[PDB]
Amino acid sequence: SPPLSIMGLMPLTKEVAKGSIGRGVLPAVELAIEQIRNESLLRPYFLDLRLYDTECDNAKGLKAFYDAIKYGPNHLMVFGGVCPSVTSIIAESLQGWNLVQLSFAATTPVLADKKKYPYFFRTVPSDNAVNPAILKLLKHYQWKRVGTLTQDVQRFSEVRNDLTGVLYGEDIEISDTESFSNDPCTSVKKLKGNDVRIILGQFDQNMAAKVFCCAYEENMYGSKYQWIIPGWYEPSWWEQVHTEANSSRCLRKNLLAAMEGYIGVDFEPLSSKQIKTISGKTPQQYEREYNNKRSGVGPSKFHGYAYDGIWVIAKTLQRAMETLHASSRHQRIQDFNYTDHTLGRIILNAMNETNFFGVTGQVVFRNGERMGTIKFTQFQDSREVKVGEYNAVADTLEIINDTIRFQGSEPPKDKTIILEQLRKISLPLYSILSALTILGMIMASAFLFFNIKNRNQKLIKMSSPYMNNLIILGGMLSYASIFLFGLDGSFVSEKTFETLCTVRTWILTVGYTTAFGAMFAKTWRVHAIFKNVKKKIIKDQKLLVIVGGMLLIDLCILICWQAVDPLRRTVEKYSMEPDPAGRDISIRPLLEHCENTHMTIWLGIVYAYKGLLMLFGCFLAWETRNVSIPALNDSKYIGMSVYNVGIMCIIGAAVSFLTRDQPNVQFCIVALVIIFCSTITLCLVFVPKLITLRTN
C-alpha cells in the first residue's frame, strides 16, 4: 500500500533544557502507531511519521523546517511543537503552504485568536480554561466582591482581559484592579486600604515569593482572606527559592504560616472514571502499559495528551478521505505541492468536527480550543492536596469533601456588616427629670389644695378664686408637655409618633394661653372696677367668657393648619461609621425628627400675638401701678413674673432651635426652661397671699 506521511518537530538531544519532555512522550506515541498497524483502519494506505529536531532554538528550528520542506517527501499535516516561540513562528505562516498543525504542549493563551491562526489546533486546555471554572467556584460559596492582582507580561494580561468578558452578565463585580512590574507590595497597601478580602492572582514563580513575603508584614492572612493562585509550579518550589539566606524581610517559619491554604488551579492528566474507550482498554490498563513500556526514562505529564492526538489524526484522515468521490479522491493525494487550496479546505472542515471518548474524556473542540477538565489543589500541612474537579462539557463542579478545610469554622465573608443604629436619650436623665416634674406636680397639688381650702376664710382679698384655679390648672396642663417631650423610636414603634408631635403643641399652647389670660383677667377687673363710677360686681363670668374666646381663637389658629398642610417625620443619618468596642461590624448613626417643609414659617404669627398679649399685660400693669391699692390688688408681682418669663423664653427658643446634632443637651435645656419658669410664676402668684392668710 502507498504510504502517507506527517511531519513532527520536538526536542530530542540532551544538551537542551526541554529534551526530556520529548523523551517523555516518544514511547507513548510508539505504542499508538502499533495500535493502528494491527487493524489498519486506513486500509488501502499506510501511516508514516517523520521526526525532526528543534532544540528550542529559532535558528535551528527554522533551518530544520526549511530543510524538511526542501528535502522531504509529500507531507500532509504537522504534529508537535512544544517550545513557546518556535511554535508561534511556525504557526503564523501556515496559510502559505496549506497545512494543518496539531499541538499537544503549547499552553500559551495568545494562540486562541483565530483571526491570524486559522490552521492550528491543540489537544490541551490552555490558560483560558481557568476563567469559567473559578466562576463556578464562587457559586459554591457566594462571594460577590473580588480583587485582582496581576503582573505585566503578555501571557499574564490575556487572562486578565478574558476574565472581564467571562464575568460579565452575572451579579459579580470587580472591586479593584492593580498591576505591578517589579515591586509587588506597593499595590498590596492599596488593596489593604480598599479593604478587599478575595484575591485572584496571576504571576509567575519568581514574584510569588515576593508577594507572599510582602503580604505577611501587612497582616493579610489568617481566617479572613482567600487567595486564588495558578498552580502549574514544580513541586517543592518554596524550599529552593533561596539557596543562601538572601531573601530577608521574611523568614521561613513566618512564610509557611503566611501562605496557608491558597487555592491552586490546574488541569488534570488522566480520567478518574472507567469505561472501554475507542482503543479497547481501560485508562488504568493504558497507564499500566505506559508505566512498564518505558525502560528507565522518567515520567512526564504530557504522555496522555499525546496518545489521543494520533487517533484524532487517524479519524480525521479516515473521515476526510472516504468522501463521495473515489477516483479523484485517490488520485489527488500525490500531486500535493503545498499549493492545493481545495485539499486544505477539505482537510480543515473535516478536522473541525470530532467526538469520541479517548483517555482524557471526550475529545471535543470549540473554535479551535479543546473542552477539557480542571483540577483544584490546596496547601495543607506544608503539602499540596487535590480537592476537587470541574467538568467542561457538562459544566458541573464536584467537591471532594472530607479533604477541604478552613482556618476558622466557616467560609469567610466578602465584606463586613453595616448596621444602622438610632441615638437614644440617657435613661438616668429621663428618670431624674421625671422625678423632679413629679415633685413639682405634688407641690402644685398642695397649692391648689390651699386655694380651695380657705376660699371663704377671713376675706383674703376676695378676688379670683376661679381665675387662680385656672392659672394652676394651666400650669398642671403645661407639666404634661415636659412629661411628653422625651420620646424614642424604640418606645413608640411608629404607632403614635405621627400624632403626639402635633398634639404636644396643642397642649402647650392651650396651657400658655389659659395661664396668661387668667393672669391678665384679674388686673382687667381691677382696672374696670376703679372707673366709670357706688361699686358692685361688674361681671360674674364675662371675663371667663372672654378668656375662653381668646383660648378658642388661638386654638382654632392651630386646628385650621392640619387640613392640607402636614408636618411629619424626616429621619436623617450621619455616615461617620466608627468601630465598636473591639468588634468589626461597622455601625452608622441615624436619628429621627418631626419637621416640615416650611419650618421658617408658622412661628412669627404666634410669637407676635403672644407679644401683643404681653403688651396688653404691660398696659394693665401701667393702669394698676399708679393706684397704690391694698393687698387685694397686685401690680408688682405680675411685672416681675412677665420680666422673668419673657427673657427666658426668648433665649430658650433660639437656643433649642440650634442644637440639632446633640440630642442629649436640648432635652436638658428645654426641661429647665419649662420648670424654672413655671415654678417662678407659681411662687410669685400664690405665696404672697398665702403668707398673708397664714398671718391673718
Binding site: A59, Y66, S93, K116, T177
Partner: protein, 689 residues
C-alpha cells in the same frame, strides 16, 4: 564587461507602517548612480530583488523561503519594519549572511550577543524619553499612566522610559496592555480615572482605540494624550470599514494631543559625498513620485534608504573575488564585517558613525493638533538642554490642566453686618458712661452727700465702661490681625474681661454687704473688718479685685493662650471647578481650658448667688440713704441672671459665626445699659427736681 551581484530586499507597502511607497523609488534613484560611476565600483554592478511584504511575519517567512532557495546567490538582506527585522536578524545566523536594515527602531536590537551580523542606519527609539520627561517637568506633573500594544518594540521603550523616569521623582501609577481588542483597557482607564495618558501602538490600532475612547467620554478638558509622530498627516480622515465611528465623531475626539518626532535631514547647506545638497534630493524625489508628497507614507525615512546603499558601496570598495561566495563559508563574512565596522563619512542624514548604541542625531520636534491641522510648537536638544519655545499652544482657558488637588480655607463671619452693628452699639454707650461719670464729678452733691460717698459709684461707672469697651478685641480674627500678634489680641480680651466685670461687681457687692451687716447684729462689729473711712469699701474692693489679679497672673504666665486650629468635614461642590475645599476655623485657646474656665466660673457663681441672696434678704428698710441699696439690688439681680444664663451657653457652641459672638455681645451691652440707667436715673431726677 563587468560582473553582476544581487541583494535581497523587502519593501512594506501596506499595514501598520507603509513606507515602501516612498522608499522603493529612492533606492531606484541610488542604484542607477552607483552602477554608473567607475570610481567606486570598477568591475561590478549591483542588482535588487525586491518583494512586497506588508511587514507581516507570514508573508515575510514565505518570501524569505522563496529568496533563500533560488539560483542567483545573494549577498545582503534588507528588511523593513521591526517585526520582520528581528525575525530576519535572528534567523540569518545559520546561513552566514549580513542584515542591513533601514527602518527598524527597536531598542532591543542593540544586544550584540543575539544579533551578530546585523547593522542599521535608523537611530534608536530611546531618543523620545529625554524629551517627554522634560515636558513633564515644565508643566509640573507627577502621576501618569501608560497604554501599549504588547509587541517588544514598545515594551523595550516602556522599560527604558520607566527606568529613566525614576531619576526625576515621577512615578507610574496604572499600566494596561492589549493584543488585539483595546475595549477592556480603555474601560479600566476610564473607571480608574487617570489624567495623563501615554500611548504606544501602531497606526492601524490608533483608530481601533480612538473609536472606543470616544464612546466613553474620555476626552475634553481634563485629559492629556501623548502619542508618536511618524503617523500619516491625515490618519483619522480616511475610511476604515473595521470601525463604527464617523469622521466628525473622531475629529472632536483627537483634538488636543501632543506628538514628538525626530528629524532625519541635515538642515544646513553643505556638499555631500554625492555632489548634492540637502534639499535638491528632496526636490528630485518629489518629482520622481506620482502622488502628493504630503500623504505618501514613509516620506521622512527616504535619506536613510539613500545612505544605506552608499555605505555598502564604500565598504565593498574598501574590500574590493566576489564570485565564489557560498552559504557555508565564514572567512569572507568576518572580513566584510570588519570592513563595514570601520566606515564613516558624510551623506544626506549627516555623519554615519555606524557602530554605537544609536543616538547619532541630536534634535527632536514637538507638534500639536489644532482644528484638524498640525502646528510645530518648539524644537529641543539633548546635550546642552536647549529648548527653543515659541508660545503657539492654545489650551482651554489659557492654561494646561493638572492632576487632582485640594485647597485649604479658613472661616470668617459677617465682618460687616454683624460686627459694625455691635461696634456702633458699643460706641453709643461708652460715651454716655463717661458723661454720666462727669455729671457725678462736677455736680454739687446734696442728696448724694447725704447718701453714701460717690467714689464707690465712680468705681462702678468706670467698671461698666471698661467692661463695655471689650467688643473690639473679640470680633477681630485672621481677617485683619490674626497672623503674628494674635497672643496680644487674646491678652486684650482676657485683661479687659478680667477687669471690667470684677471692678463694678465688687463696687456693688461691698455696698450690699455693708447694708446687710450694719442693721440687726449686736455680737461683734464695732470697728471690724475695716475702719469707718471710705478706705473700708476701698480696701475690701481692693482685696476682691486683687484676688482676680492673682487668678489672671497665674495662668497667664504658667499656661497662656496662643492659637488653635480646628478642622472638620470637607468636599464642598466648589462650583464645578476641579478642586476640593477643606474648611477649618481658628480660635484662641490653651492646651487646657475646661478646668480653669470651670473653676473660675464656679468660684464667681457662688459669689454671685451669695450676692443675690444678700440683696433679697433686705428689701424695704432705709435710713440716712437716699436710693442706693434698692437700685444696686435691682442692678445686681439683672446682672446676675443675665450672666448665669449667658455664660454656660458660649462654651457649648463652637460654631462662632453668629452665635458665640452675638450672645456675649448682647449680654454685655444689655447689662451695661440697664445697670447704668437704673443706677443713675434718680440722681438726675432729684437734681432736676
Amino acid at each position: 564587461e563587468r560582473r553582476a551581484v544581487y541583494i535581497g530586499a523587502l519593501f512594506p507597502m501596506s499595514g501598520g507602517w507603509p513606507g515602501g511607497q516612498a522608499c522603493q523609488p529612492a533606492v531606484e534613484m541610488a542604484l542607477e548612480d552607483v552602477n554608473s560611476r567607475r570610481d567606486i565600483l570598477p568591475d561590478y554592478e549591483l542588482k535588487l530583488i525586491h518583494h512586497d511584504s506588508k511587514c507581516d511575519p507570514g508573508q515575510a517567512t514565505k518570501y524569505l523561503y522563496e529568496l533563500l532557495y533560488n539560483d542567483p546567490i545573494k549577498i545582503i538582506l534588507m528588511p523593513g519594519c521591526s517585526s520582520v527585522s528581528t525575525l530576519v536578524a535572528e534567523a540569518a545566523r545559520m546561513w552566514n549572511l549580513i542584515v542591513l536594515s533601514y527602518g527598524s527602531s527597536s531598542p532591543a536590537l542593540s544586544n550584540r550577543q543575539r544579533f551578530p551580523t546585523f547593522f542599521r542606519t535608523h537611530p534608536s527609539a530611546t531618543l523620545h524619553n529625554p524629551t517627554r520627561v522634560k515636558l513633564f517637568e515644565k508643566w509640573g506633573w507627577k502621576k501618569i499612566a501608560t497604554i501599549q500594544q504588547t509587541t517588544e518594540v514598545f515594551t523595550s521603550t516602556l522599560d527604558d522610559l520607566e527606568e529613566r523616569v525614576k531619576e526625576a521623582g515621577i512615578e507610574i501609577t496604572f499600566r494596561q496592555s492589549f493584543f488585539s481588542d483595546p475595549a477592556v483597557p480603555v474601560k479600566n482607564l476610564k473607571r480608574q480615572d487617570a489624567r495623563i495618558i501615554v500611548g504606544l501602538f501602531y497606526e492601524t490600532e490608533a483608530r481601533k482605540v480612538f473609536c472606543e475612547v470616544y464612546k466613553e467620554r474620555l476626552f475634553g478638558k481634563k485629559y492629556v494624550w501623548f502619542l508618536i509622530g511618524w503617523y500619516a498627516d491625515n490618519w483619522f480622515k480616511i475610511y476604515d470599514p473595521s470601525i463604527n465611528c464617523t469622521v466628525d465623531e473622531m475629529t472632536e475626539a483627537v483634538e488636543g494631543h501632543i506628538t514628538t518626532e525626530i528629524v532625519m535631514l541635515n538642515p544646513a547647506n553643505t556638499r555631500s559625498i554625492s555632489n548634492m545638497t540637502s534639499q535638491e534630493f528632496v526636490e528630485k524625489l518629489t518629482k520622481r513620485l506620482k502622488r502628493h508628497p504630503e500623504e505618501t507614507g514613509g516620506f521622512q525615512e527616504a535619506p536613510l534608504a539613500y545612505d544605506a546603499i552608499w555605505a555598502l558601496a564604500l565598504a565593498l570598495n574598501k574590500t574590493s573575488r566576489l564570485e565564489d561566495f557560498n552559504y557555508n563559508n565564514q572567512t569572507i563574512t568576518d572580513q566584510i564585517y570588519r570592513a563595514m565596522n570601520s566606515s564613516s563619512f558624510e551623506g544626506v542624514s549627516g555623519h554615519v558613525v555606524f557602530d554605537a548604541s544609536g543616538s547619532r542625531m541630536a534634535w527632536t520636534l514637538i507638534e500639536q493638533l489644532q482644528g484638524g491641522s498640525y502646528k510645530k510648537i518648539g524644537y529641543y536638544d539633548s546635550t546642552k538642554d536647549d529648548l527653543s519655545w515659541s508660545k503657539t499652544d492654545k489650551w482651554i482657558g489659557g492654561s494646561p490642566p493638572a492632576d487632582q488637588t485640594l485647597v485649604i480655607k479658613t472661616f470668617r463671619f459677617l465682618s460687616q453686618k454683624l460686627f459694625i452693628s455691635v461696634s456702633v452699639l458699643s460706641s453709643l454707650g461708652i460715651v454716655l458712661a463717661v458723661v454720666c461719670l462727669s455729671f457725678n464729678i462736677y455736680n454739687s452733691h446734696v442728696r448724694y452727700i447725704q447718701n453714701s460717698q460717690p467714689n464707690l459709684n465712680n468705681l462702678t461707672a468706670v467698671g461698666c465702661s471698661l467692661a463695655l469697651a471689650a467688643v473690639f478685641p473679640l470680633g477681630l480674627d485672621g481677617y485683619h490681625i490674626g497672623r503674628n500678634q494674635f497672643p496680644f489680641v487674646c491678652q486684650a480680651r482676657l485683661w479687659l474681661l478680667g477687669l471690667g466685670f470684677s471692678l463694678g461687681y465688687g463696687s456693688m457687692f461691698t455696698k450690699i454687704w455693708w447694708v446687710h451687716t450694719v442693721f440687726t447684729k449686736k455680737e461683734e462689729k464695732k470697728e471690724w473688718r475695716k475702719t469707718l473711712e471710705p478706705w473700708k469699701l476701698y480696701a475690701t474692693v481692693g482685696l476682691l479685685v486683687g484676688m482676680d489679679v492673682l487668678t489672671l497672673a497665674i495662668w497667664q504666665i504658667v499656661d497662656p493662650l496662643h492659637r488653635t486650629i480646628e478642622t472638620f468635614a470637607k468636599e464642598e461642590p466648589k462650583e464645578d471647578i476641579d478642586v476640593s475645599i477643606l474648611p477649618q476655623l481658628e480660635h484662641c485657646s490653651s492646651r487646657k481650658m475646661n478646668t480653669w474656665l470651670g473653676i473660675f466660673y464656679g468660684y464667681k457663681g457662688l459669689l454671685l448667688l451669695l450676692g443675690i441672696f444678700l440683696a433679697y434678704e433686705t428689701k424695704s428698710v432705709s435710713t440716712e440713704k437716699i436710693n442706693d441699696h434698692r437700685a444696686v439690688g435691682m442692678a445686681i439681680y439683672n446682672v446676675a441672671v443675665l450672666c448665669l444664663i449667658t455664660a454656660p451657653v458660649t462654651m457649648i457652641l463652637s460654631s462662632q459665626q453668629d452665635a458665640a459672638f452675638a450672645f456675649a455681645s448682647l449680654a454685655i451691652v444689655f447689662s451695661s445699659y440697664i445697670t447704668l440707667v437704673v443706677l443713675f436715673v434718680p440722681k438726675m431726677r432729684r437734681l432736676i427736681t
